[PDB]
Ligand binder design. Structure first.
Ligand SMILES: Nc1ncnc2c1ncn2[C@@H]1O[C@H](COP(=O)(O)OP(=O)(O)O)[C@@H](O)[C@H]1O
Lengths: 341, 370
């Protein structure tokens, strides 16, 4: 994912260092002698160093959309940049490259020498890399990877955010942190999607489903209160930094409320089925409403959101209307059942 | 970004160039263009028509030497293109005009068209990454190391004085007359004719320049020496003849201090200095009189500095320390100053990029002319 391009040197210099390598002598700067203070020689040297500066700048200033790809991709991308910039420092610190720099310094040409460290943004890139270097090492995303139980997710979410708490000392950006949070919610949603897949939730009783329901809201509340603690955390961070009055968007619509709202509609849905199926058992309206009940509800189909609204808003209010029309008789029937006497 | 800045010091008589950071200009040759006069008959002759540099100097008899620049103003741009192109040839630089930003010296008070068309020439035919036109006095003071003082130069076609205060070259005190080295040689040619010796060929005017460079001096007393008969030293031509000069050797560079001999209402060099100093802030006159720097090849005559001191003392107010410096690199003052200026990190922000020139145009050059 990161281009690591070597720095090519002029071949004659390699032959000179090769001649010194046959002996074991350190290839000196004045080995060229008269060739040092010549025009075409220094001309080609600056050409090579100039292309080196472009090779360094090719990857140091590189940047992509912080929300592009999944969470692990962006996090791993920052890690890749850290080790890659260290490899650029490795190519910078070799004695052969330093030998070329010594040629340009000994030849009184300060341009490529000073620009080799200033024009290259490697120094500032490495210092920002080092500022984010402990923050990127030992990231507990694997705690979120193999977490299928909601309790594991509760403790995992709190653990990851407490490890992320070290962004008060490393200047974390605003929008970067918000896209980071949405990436965290992306993986949370993915894990929950397969969790609902391996749950077979459309066949269990309301006891187990109630426990799973409460556990889902447990995870959601860990998200809300700990996210507000992270909010206050970033609030005091922006206060201690004292930079400006930007229009920072905190109107975050993450990847988990999308399922949370559907859950809420199902809560009141189970209230209808709770009062009915829990009592109705107590003339065929009993059976008939369970008949029409299951008949308009047995096809949730992996309960995704898109088809959820797309067809289930009609099938949903249609289930309500099937109760109603089915349950329409009982009202006036009750008016019969007891008003006659 | 590019390789290294190339300091090309122009001059109406001698162009001087090299890379920045260099100690002395490695490439210097006369600013003329010689094309043959005779007829190509025998095969295997000197191929090519236009000659510049050492080859044009060597076979001097065949050429019909002309100058493309006079009084710091370019008269022919084609010959200047060939001269600059020659600077980038294999005989002088062996480089390309695409990887080198260019520092360009230029005389003050010149027309805008010089900077404009010269910029077009560089950024279009040469396509240099960055061009930077500058003064010449500023560079000479940078070459001496000090910072505030006037600069008195007299090259081959121009002569001027610039009172520089810490780098800000005061633009309201730059006196400039057009009587320099080449014109002194021209007047010397007239006096040689009056002696009896005739030199009128274009490739013989150069011999007149050689005589000016090695047989003239400056009399301390301008009139007392004219009322005497000198020893009349001889001179050996390249031909092998002999010329006895006589009085035509001290009156020839006398022109610089009195352009009445050429018939002109201009002023001498001393008056250019005194007017350049007096047309400045009264609070800086003593500092300027204590710091005068000479540059340019016409300041190499014998008895030049001494006569300049006498003249300035006659024009400066009483009991004011006058001090004229005269470094050993008056021919290379502007070039060495260019080597010091262009070798700095601020030069990156001081030039004009090619992109900028393509965006705004010549107005960008006049905008960032300093
Ligand atoms: N020894 C000398 N004595 C007098 N004049 C000289 C001597 N050497 C050179 N010159 C004149 O000085 C001129 C050099 O000045 P130049 O370097 O051309 O200034 P610029 O380069 O700014 O035009 C030459 O034209 C030459 O005629």
């Amino acid at each position: 994912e990161i281009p690591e391009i070597s720095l090519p040197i002029h071949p004659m210099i390699t032959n000179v260092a090769k001649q010194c390598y046959e002996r074991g002598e350190k290839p000196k700067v004045t080995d060229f002698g008269d060739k040092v203070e010549d025009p075409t020689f220094l001309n080609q040297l600056q050409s090579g160093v100039n292309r080196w500066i472009r090779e360094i700048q090719k990857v140091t200033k590189l940047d992509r959309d912080p929300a592009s790809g999944t969470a692990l991709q962006e996090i791993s991308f920052w890690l890749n940049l850290e080790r890659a910039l260290y490899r650029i420092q490795e190519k910078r610190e070799s004695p052969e490259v330093l030998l070329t720099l010594d040629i340009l310094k000994h030849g009184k040409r300060f341009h490529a020498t000073v620009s080799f460290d200033t024009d290259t943004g490697l120094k500032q890139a490495l210092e920002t890399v080092n500022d984010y270097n402990p923050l990127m090492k030992d990231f507990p995303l694997n705690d979120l990877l193999s977490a299928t139980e909601l309790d594991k997710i509760r403790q995992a979410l709190v653990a990851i955010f407490t490890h992320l708490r070290k962004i008060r000392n490393t200047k974390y950006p605003i929008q970067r942190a918000l896209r980071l949070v949405e990436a965290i919610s992306r993986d949370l949603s993915s894990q929950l999607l397969k969790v609902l897949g391996t749950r077979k939730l459309m066949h269990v009783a309301y006891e187990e489903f109630e426990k799973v329901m409460v556990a889902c809201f447990e995870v959601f509340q860990t998200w809300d209160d700990e996210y507000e603690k992270l909010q206050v955390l970033l609030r005091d961070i922006v206060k201690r930094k004292r930079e400006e009055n930007l229009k920072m968007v905190w109107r975050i619509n993450p990847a988990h409320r999308k399922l949370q709202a559907r859950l809420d509609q199902m809560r009141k849905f189970r209230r209808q089925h709770e009062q009915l199926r829990a009592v109705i058992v107590r003339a065929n309206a009993i059976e008939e409403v369970n008949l029409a009940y299951e008949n308009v509800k047995e096809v949730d189909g992996l309960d995704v959101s898109k088809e959820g609204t797309e067809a289930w808003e009609a099938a949903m209010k249609r289930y309500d209307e099937r109760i109603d029309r089915v349950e329409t008789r009982i009202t006036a029937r009750l008016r019969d059942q007891l008003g006659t006497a | 970004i590019a390789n290294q800045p190339v300091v090309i010091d122009n001059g109406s008589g001698v162009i001087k160039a090299g890379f920045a950071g260099d100690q002395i200009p490695k490439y210097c040759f006369p600013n003329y263009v010689g094309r043959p006069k005779h007829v190509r008959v025998m095969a295997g002759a000197l191929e090519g028509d236009i000659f510049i540099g050492p080859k044009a100097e060597e076979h001097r008899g065949l050429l019909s030497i002309r100058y493309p620049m006079e009084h710091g103003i370019v008269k022919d741009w084609n010959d200047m293109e060939r001269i600059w192109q020659y600077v980038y040839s294999k005989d002088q630089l062996q480089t390309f005009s695409e990887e080198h930003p260019v520092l360009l010296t230029e005389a003050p008070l010149n027309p805008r068209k010089n900077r404009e068309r010269a910029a077009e020439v560089f950024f279009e035919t040469f396509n240099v990454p960055a061009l930077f036109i500058s003064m010449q006095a500023v560079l000479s003071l940078y070459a001496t190391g000090r910072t505030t003082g006037v600069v008195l130069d007299s090259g081959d076609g121009v002569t001027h004085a610039v009172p520089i205060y810490e780098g800000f070259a005061m633009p309201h005190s730059i006196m400039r007359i057009d009587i320099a080295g080449r014109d002194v040689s021209r007047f010397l040619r007239l006096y040689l004719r009056k002696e009896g010796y005739d030199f009128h060929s274009s490739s013989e005017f150069e011999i007149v320049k050689a005589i000016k460079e090695r047989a003239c001096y400056l009399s301390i007393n301008p009139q007392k020496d004219e009322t005497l008969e000198t020893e009349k030293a001889q001179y050996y031509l390249p031909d092998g003849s002999t010329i006895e000069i006589g009085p035509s050797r001290f009156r020839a560079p006398e022109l610089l201090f009195r352009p009445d001999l050429i018939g002109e209402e201009s002023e001498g060099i001393h008056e250019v200095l005194v007017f350049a100093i007096q047309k400045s802030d009264m609070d800086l006159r003593r500092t300027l009189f204590s710091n005068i720097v000479l540059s340019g090849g016409s300041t190499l005559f014998k008895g030049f500095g001494d006569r300049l001191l006498s003249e300035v003392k006659k024009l400066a107010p009483k009991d004011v320390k006058i001090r004229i410096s005269a470094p050993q690199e008056r021919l290379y003052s502007t070039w060495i100053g260019g080597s010091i200026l262009a070798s700095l990190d601020t030069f990156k922000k001081m030039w004009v990029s090619k992109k900028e020139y393509e965006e705004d145009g010549a107005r960008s050059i006049h905008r960032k002319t300093f």
